[PDB]
Each structure stands twice: as structure tokens, then as C-alpha cells.
Amino acid sequence: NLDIIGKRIEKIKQEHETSWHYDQDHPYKTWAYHGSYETKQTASSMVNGVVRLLTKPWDIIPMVTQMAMTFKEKVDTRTQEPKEGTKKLMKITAEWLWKELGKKKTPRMCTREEFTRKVRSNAALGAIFNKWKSAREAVEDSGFWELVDKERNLHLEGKCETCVYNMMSRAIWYMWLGARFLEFEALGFLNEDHWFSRENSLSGVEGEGLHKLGYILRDVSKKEGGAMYADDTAGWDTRITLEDLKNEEMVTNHMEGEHKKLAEAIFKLTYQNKVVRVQRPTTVMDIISRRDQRGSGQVVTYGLNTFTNMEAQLIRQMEGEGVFKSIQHLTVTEEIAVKNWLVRVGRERLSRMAISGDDCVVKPLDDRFASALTALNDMGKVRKDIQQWEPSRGWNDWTQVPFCSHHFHELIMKDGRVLVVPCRNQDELIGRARISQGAGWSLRETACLGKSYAQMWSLMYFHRRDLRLAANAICSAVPSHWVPTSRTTATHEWMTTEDMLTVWNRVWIQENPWMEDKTPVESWEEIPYLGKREDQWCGSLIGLTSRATWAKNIQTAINQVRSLIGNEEYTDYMPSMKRFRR
Ligand SMILES: CCn1c(NC(C)=O)nc2ccccc21
């Protein structure tokens, strides 16, 4: 407790020595409270005018327009200690899973050099302003690295001074860039060296891309077994137990030298003991601590979420298969049985899953899985929107299964070849493309963000009539040579100045391991759509008067945006579609 977090707490006290006050009306039940001090401050969602001017029919669709307008009583809840049988199942499974993930990978420190390159191309690291303005500037300045050094030698000494979280079903924990560096140095290898790739982890999909996820679900569907289960957890990050954090730390058993010590310190000092600053309007800053829940960088959070979810779902499969009888207590012979299941069929059972952080699809050996709930509930991974002891409802068709906010269609090209394509309700796609984050956007930067959405649509959602037409319109309205941009950066093949038909051929034909015939597609008209009725089911406006006027008059909308941007070099992409091809 306070021996590990005191120094951090004591240091914050002194920089606010005039304001420190142990408040009596503190709202915390499950967080340990330590004190308060004076502050005052908060960026809402802005509309992208280029995308909105080229999507006029959606200006009267509330599901689109409401997206641009605008529970913290879940972070203040407490998960119970699992029972002895559960803790044993988790420890045995975690031990086995780190060994499997480590068979063909070597843990290693990530470098200042790697960190510096990351910041200089805008990956959302979850940092803050202060001393230097941005991340870009702190990294050049040698003073920073001396701060990093001080903390670093403090961590080698098993102590912490400056690794403090800042709080702000989405609760995001920013730290200062130095704290994020030390996290990345110790645990960045999990993402940087693709520990959760499908090749390496069998269940994982890290680096796979939205154009692979449907093919992966169809491959899971080919296994003999029961229904496909896709149960969401209620507030996954808030249900991570101290026992979960201790099984995650066992990755350090695979490390050596300095790295082992640096990694052990991140787990001990920042993950299994946390210090947090939360803005309370009543305006103070509260300095609160707790031992459990997930609060790491968003990229380390993804890998450890994937790890602990893989572990949980293997244990639920063991329960359905009757490998153990009760979570109260594993006998000595049950331990040997669980161990022999893992050695014997563990890799086969991992291949029956697709797991992206807290998101999973499982095709178990049979439907006993549906009612195998004791371990899942006792680990604290309580299912969303179903009663605790009500059996899971599975999906009979891989094309109906939800995964990573999508479903997947099987789409046959006029030449007989098979595409498995990502899809979601089209109101969600248009509503997200109409939103920008942050201030100070020039017209050119706003246009380049619209172009990024347009190229994503041409690559991933070409099968939706309205999105292929709107993508062509935006790419016609933005100068041909202007480079697509984003402010937070799945594989992103649309973020390129290359012709989108050439990128389509590379992604869907040449590099697609599920496509045996590699004959290139010569035009967009070879590339199919969903059925018209299926397109309407997934939110198309095809058939409406508003949509017919928009499509017919599209060159007038394109010219409105071209007139605002000014006299630049533009390409007309609309004749790539049959109906505008004369
Ligand atoms: C090398 C790949 N590539 C990119 N990619 C970018 C800008 O990331 N833009 C291109 C334009 C024409 C031809 C190839 C191109």
C-alpha cells in the first residue's frame, strides 16, 4: 500500500501545498481517497463540412445527425476474490499460455529510437501537455530523457515518483510522456513484435485488418462443433481482478537482466498499485488509488485484454467439456487433467476462437458451452444484457455473428470468385465520417480527413451502393494529389496516394490468401455490390427520392465543394460507375 504509492502522493501534495485539504464529502466507496487541491478546466465533436456537403440526404436522418451532438458509477464498483478452484484454473492456464506465446518470440526492450519514431507520426499514446507543448518537442529535448532516467533508476530500485494516471462505457487514463515511454520500453514488444497475431497466438487477430476478419470467422465456422458464441462482457476493464493482473505479470518469467526488472516494476508499481487524478466539479482535483481494474496505455491494454480473454474463454471451454467439476476446489488429479487437456488439445481450442481484446467469438466442441457459466461468473467476466445464470444464445450462421463492431457478407463476383466483406449499419459509417476531433483544422486538413474516410469506404465498403458513390464524389471534390490524414491512427491500406483500384487489387486479390485465382480486376464495374434488398437491410437509402436526386445531381455537389476549396487540380472519379459512364 502507501509505501509503494506514498512518494507519488507526497510529491503531488508539495506542488499544491497552499490547496491540500482532506475533504469529508468525497464521493469514493471503492477507490482509496488521499486528498484534494484547486484546478479549473474541461473539446467536443466538430462536423467535417466536406463529408457533410457530399452526404446531403443524411442531413434529415436522426441516427446520423445525433451522432455529432453532446457509466462512471462502474469505475467505482468492486469485483470479489475468485474461489480457490478458479484461481488454480487461471494460474495453470496463464502459465501454459505465456509459454505457447513465447515458443517462437523473444521478449525484448523497445527503444528511445522506436518511441521517437512513433511520436513523429501520431500514434495516440495517451499523454499530456506542463514543460514542453507536444510529444514531438519533449522527445528532441535531452532534459526529458534525464527525467526518464531518474524515474528509470527509481524503478530499478523498486520505487516510483512520477507514474500517475489522469482520468477523463469509455474511461481513458492519460500519463505524462515519460511514464508512457517506460511502459513502452518494458511491454511494447507485445504489440511491436505481434505476440497476438493469428500465426503466433491462434485466437488473436492483431495486425489482421478488417478485410481478413470475415475470412477468419468463416474458417472458425468450418470446424465441427456447436453454435458460434459472441458474449460481450459488461465493462471488461472494470472486471480485471488483482488475480488477473498477477497472471498477466508472469510474462516477466520469460525475461532476463534489466528488462525483467523494468517489466516487474511496471506491473508492481503502476498496474497492481495505481495513483489517479480525477476532475470533480464540486473544482478540486482528487488523488485516489486502487490495486485492481485495467489502467495502462491503450496498446498494452489491448494485448493484456486479449491474453486474459483467451485464458477466460479456454477455461469456459474446459467447463463445457467437463474437464473439472467445481470452481470451489481443484483436486490434485483435476490439476493433472487440466494440464493434459492444454498439452493435448489447447492449440486446437485456441484455433476455435477469434479474440480482439475484450471482444470474442468462440465455436466450442458442442453447445454445453452455452450453460457453462460458473468459472466465467466467478472470474468476474459477467455477460452484458443477460441474467447471470441464463444460458448464452449462440449464432447458427457465421454471417450473422457480431465481431469488432461488424458483421460479414459472402459476396460472389460475376467471375465466380468469393469475397468475404466487412459491413455495419450505414448510418454508423456516414455519421462517423461526418465528425472530426480537435481544433485548428484548415479547409485543406478537413478535406484530407474526408478523403481518408472516402478511400476506407472504396477499400472496405465498396459493396454498399451509397458509400461507393459518396467515396467517388469526395475523391472527385478533393484535389487529386492531396494526401489523406488522420489525428489518431487495424492495417490502414487506404492511407496512401496510390490509385484505389490498384490498392483494391493488392488487398482483395494479390495478397488475399483465400483467393487462389490471382487474375487482376481491370475496372470498378467488375467489383460487385450486396443484393439491393441486403443493402437496404444494412441501411442503404437506395429507393428513396432524396437519394435518387442526390445521385442524379452529384456533379453539382462536387462543384460546390471544388468552388470552396478553390482553383486546384481535380480528377472526376464518377465515370468509374456504370450510371455516370455516359
Ligand atoms: C509506395 C506506395 N505509395 C504511396 N504510399 C504512401 C504515400 O504512403 N503513395 C503512392 C503513390 C503512387 C505510387 C505508390 C505509392
Ligand SMILES: [Zn+2]
Ligand atoms: Zn514510476
Ligand SMILES: [Zn+2]
Ligand atoms: Zn451488412
